Amino acid sequence: MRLAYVKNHEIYGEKLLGLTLRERIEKTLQRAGFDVRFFDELSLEEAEDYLIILEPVLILERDLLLEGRKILVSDGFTVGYFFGGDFRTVFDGNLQSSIEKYLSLNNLESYEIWAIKLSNDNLKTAEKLLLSSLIGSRGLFAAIFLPIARLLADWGVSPDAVTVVGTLGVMAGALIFYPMGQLFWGTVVITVFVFSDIIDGLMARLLFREGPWGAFLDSYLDRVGDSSVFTGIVIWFFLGGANPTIAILALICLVLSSLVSYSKARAEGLGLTANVGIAERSERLVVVLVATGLVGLGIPSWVLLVVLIVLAIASVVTIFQRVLTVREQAKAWTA
Ligand SMILES: [Mg+2]
């Protein structure tokens, strides 16, 4: 069990991007596996790791990995100390005194982390920094949605609301516009609300909701979305689209799509893993949407037929890949 003592301060009560700074440092340290104690005066408990934070600080680093004793610094600032179990034999009940004694006893180097010291003046800056920490190599497409995430975070909008709203948007394009025969506009509707995923991802990262529920809902609503897309196609071409062979191929892809998702979900239930295959959910989505949009613009429908065939075949080999690897894992685990 790991313990982290952070000293109480006046600025921790301020709210930044939907949480308090107090809540932000607490949740950050919890994700690093520390149980957090806020203290006006330190009372030490028996434990393994001891993390002492004094100055008010916003930690911008995503994964904080603490291995071995060291001093935590960011750009010249000393944000906090990491002491081992030995500090239990030093600390006599006075804070500053016990720290300098332990510093005289042990020579520890300084490890660099991404963090900013809180001041009343630089709050705007911190906010700017925190938003940029959310991108994490995802690229320009992630960055352009940062003002929307900022807006939604300030308004008290939950990431689940964004996810649900995004899914209702996809369903509206797929189950309304497609059966009407509007393939182009249905597709731009689907396309617009598909990026809501990048928004909830930013928010889930910003608002600290990474939990099993969040993951569950994202997986589930993604399934609802993809199924709706094929459903609309199937319906439209069996009726007003007047193309049964395209409708049959679309229906086959729907089923094949479900089977590709269910293999992986079911494997994980068994403790195994099945993240493999040529066909990936977003990639499958993209080619279908592009073709359907094109057909909605007057392109010959055989373009969609070809794409559905290729997608059927790609789904089949993907299923084979997943089923094969879970078999290797299962048979190896029993022996
Ligand atoms: Mg998703």
Residue numbers in the entry: -130 to 204
The article reads:
In the initial step, phosphatidylinositol-phosphate (PIP) synthases generate PIP using L-myo-inositol-1-phosphate (inositol phosphate) as the acceptor alcohol and CDP-DAG as the donor substrate; subsequently, the terminal phosphate is removed by an as-yet-unidentified phosphatase to yield PI4. All (class I) CDP-APs are integral membrane enzymes that catalyse the transfer of a substituted phosphate group from a CDP-linked donor, CDP-DAG for PI and PIP biosynthesis, to an acceptor alcohol to generate a phosphodiester-linked product. We have determined the crystal structures of PIP synthase from Renibacterium salmoninarum, in the apo form and with bound CDP-DAG to 2.5 and 3.6 Å resolution, respectively. RsPIPS adopts a homodimeric architecture similar to those previously observed in Af2299 and AfDIPP synthase, with each protomer possessing six TM helices surrounding a large polar cavity.
We determined the structure of a chimeric construct of PIP synthase from R. salmoninarum (RsPIPS)—the causative agent for bacterial kidney disease in salmonids, a major threat to these species worldwide17—in which the first six residues of the RsPIPS sequence were omitted (RsPIPS-Δ6N). Crystals of RsPIPS-Δ6N diffracted X-rays to 2.5 Å resolution, and the structure was solved by molecular replacement using the cytidylyltransferase-like domain of Af2299 as a search model. The crystals of RsPIPS-Δ6N diffracted well in the apo-state (2.5 Å), but attempts to obtain co-crystal structures with CDP-DAG were unsuccessful. In RsPIPS, the central polar cavity is located at the cytosolic boundary of the membrane, and contains three distinct regions, which together form the active site. Proximal to the nucleotide-binding site, and within the membrane-spanning region is a pocket wedged between TMs 4, 5 and 6, which probably represents the inositol phosphate acceptor-binding cavity. Several conserved residues line this cavity, including two arginine residues (R153 and R191) that in the structure of RsPIPS-Δ6N coordinate a ion present at high concentration in the crystallization solution. We hypothesize that these residues coordinate the phosphate of inositol phosphate, a moiety unique to PIP synthases. Directly above the nucleotide-binding site, we observed a gap between JM1 and TM2, creating a hydrophobic groove that is open to the membrane. We hypothesize that this diminished activity of MtPIPS-Δ6N is due to compromised binding of CDP-DAG, as JM1 is truncated and distorted in RsPIPS-Δ6N, potentially interfering with CDP-DAG binding. This could provide an explanation as to why we were unable to obtain the structure of RsPIPS-Δ6N in complex with its cognate lipid substrate.
